[PDB]
Design a protein around this ligand. Structure first.
Ligand SMILES: Cc1cc2nc3c(=O)[nH]c(=O)nc-3n(C[C@H](O)[C@H](O)[C@H](O)COP(=O)(O)OP(=O)(O)OC[C@H]3O[C@@H](n4cnc5c(N)ncnc54)[C@H](O)[C@@H]3O)c2cc1C
Length: 498
């Protein structure tokens, strides 16, 4: 049937859009391909942890996989599984694996919660057509407030065993003249302090994050989406995957949608139409829908920028072997609290997450997710044979990201007399993981595939709201930027179009 507004997906862009539509009185249907994560599993918990993965961990895989960096210790717990509508997907392109969340809340279910604003100078470089004053004065503050961003108690951080890993890297970075910053988070740090005191059920302190947090993490289902549902104008249909979009004869949109069960079986195919269509299917999902629509002729007016300008936010993972006298601890909070800030907007820029190691025993390893400034971009093209958008990206294109990461961590190693680990990512001498990302950005870039508010070029009442808008990089963990842009965009769209 017909609904005035449809929002595809339930991640950051989608959730912002749905809340503001509902508040404006617009009846809105969100279509999410994954599950609503609210039914207890076989252990009485919603989500599995990283030391007890099961089919809930993985979107339609036949074996669980260790969190990147932890294979040497966590492979022992990983198991064959039945393919299931689990929470974390690995999308494997030819030379890049992109991790994404699947469920009501999207990547907010599985992410590390780091809620970071980009440097304004870098924001102005990447998005010069956008008014940066409105972003920093209005929309970033709005996003942080709605997301329930909070800050760690710095005295507790200094004292607690659970952040020894972060203090070690801080000290090591300092010897090399590099500073660290505390990173705000949507995980409730007061709750985390109570976990450490044995006062509340553990989640961050029980090796949970990447397959969901059973407690503590304020994912979108608790924040924007709960508020959207509260308007009485928003519905969410789960296990509904949008396959196609077309323009209708009177200028609306019609979607073909597959309803599945949690085992992946097809239950129904539906056509849903609307006046206003908002894409929040993520960098991969929104881009794929639009590339397919363009190249199969169902949205033939889409421009050639649809599909272009993809990047992995410069993501590179690496690890250092600490001296014996600098153990990182058996007990490591699963939520990062510190980053190394070596981002000066030059091509040597690095902002590096100090990431925890979920082994549950002492490994002496420090793990880092580096975010770099690498101008290389990939492109999604349509493959009519498989009916899929394929990402054209080669591993060579991450050479500049590897080089920036390596320059920074070589500096830290030289200052401390330490070496890399080379054995964390498989059976190859490899210190830098250069073919994954957690932060896919672009494919439907703001101002190129769309106007400066995410209105898709060639069409009226058709909007993109999500990470596909961002031009490949933001220099920090991206969800705060996605949220803030979405707030800006939907405010304008509702005012001027709806
Ligand atoms: C392991 C990991 C760690 C991360 N850590 C951090 C962090 O600490 N801080 C940070 O800032 N960022 C982090 N990120 C990145 C962050 O989660 C993403 O940038 C953000 O979730 C992207 O938001 P989005 O709205 O673009 O899309 P998503 O959050 O990816 O949501 C897209 C939604 O659309 C659904 N969907 C897709 N296609 C369809 C379709 N055709 N039909 C119906 N539904 C569809 C998906 O199932 C999903 O629920 C992390 C991500 C991962 C995977």
């Amino acid at each position: 049937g017909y609904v005035p507004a449809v929002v595809i997906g339930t991640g950051y862009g989608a959730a912002v859009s749905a809340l503001r539509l509902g508040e404006a009185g617009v009846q809105t249907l969100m279509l999410e391909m994954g599950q609503l994560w609210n039914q207890p599993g076989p252990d009485g918990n919603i989500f599995c942890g990283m030391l007890n993965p099961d089919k809930r961990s993985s979107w339609f895989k036949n074996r669980t996989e260790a969190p990147l960096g932890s294979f040497l210790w966590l492979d022992v717990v990983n198991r064959n599984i039945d393919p299931y509508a689990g929470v974390l997907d690995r999308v494997n392109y030819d030379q890049m694996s992109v991790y994404v969340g699947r469920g009501v809340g999207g990547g907010s279910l599985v992410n590390g919660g780091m809620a970071v604003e980009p440097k304004r100078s870098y924001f102005e470089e990447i998005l010069p057509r956008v008014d940066s004053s409105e972003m920093y004065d209005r929309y970033f503050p709005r996003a942080n407030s709605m997301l329930r961003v909070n800050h760690i108690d710095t005295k507790w951080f200094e004292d607690t065993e659970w952040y020894k890993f972060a203090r070690v890297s801080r000290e090591q970075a300092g010897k090399a003249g590099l500073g660290t910053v505390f990173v705000p988070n949507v995980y409730d740090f007061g709750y985390m302090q109570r976990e450490a005191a044995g006062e509340v059920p553990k989640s961050a302190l029980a090796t949970e994050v990447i397959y969901g947090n059973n407690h503590g993490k304020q994912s979108l289902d608790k924040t924007y989406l709960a508020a959207a549902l509260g308007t009485g104008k928003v519905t969410i249909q789960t296990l509904h995957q949008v396959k196609t979009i077309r323009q209708t004869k009177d200028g609306g949109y019609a979607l073909t949608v597959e309803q599945k069960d949690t085992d992946g079986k097809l239950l129904a195919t539906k056509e849903i139409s609307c006046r206003y269509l908002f894409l929040g299917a993520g960098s991969l999902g929104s881009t794929e829908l639009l590339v397919r629509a363009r190249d199969t002729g169902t949205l033939p007016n889409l421009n050639s920028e649809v599909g272009a300008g993809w990047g992995p936010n410069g993501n590179i993972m690496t690890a250092r072997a600490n001296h014996m006298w600098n153990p990182t601890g058996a007990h490591q909070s699963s939520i990062p609290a510190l980053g190394i800030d070596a981002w000066d907007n030059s091509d040597s820029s690095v902002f590096a997450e100090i990431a925890p190691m979920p082994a549950g025993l002492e490994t002496w390893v420090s793990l880092y997710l580096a975010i770099t400034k690498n101008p290389q971009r990939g492109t999604f093209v349509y493959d009519a044979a498989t009916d899929r958008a394929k990402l054209n990206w080669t591993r060579d294109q991450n050479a500049p990201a590897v080089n920036a990461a390596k320059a920074l961590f070589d500096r830290i190693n030289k200052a401390n007399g330490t070496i890399y680990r080379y054995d964390l990512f498989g059976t190859q001498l490899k210190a830098f993981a250069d073919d994954f990302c957690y932060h896919p950005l672009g494919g439907c870039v703001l101002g190129k595939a769309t106007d400066d508010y995410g209105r898709v070029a060639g069409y009226k009442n058709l909007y993109v709201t999500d990470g596909s808008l961002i031009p490949g990089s933001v220099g920090v963990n991206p969800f705060v930027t996605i949220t803030a842009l979405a707030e800006r965009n939907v405010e304008r769209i509702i005012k001027q179009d709806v």
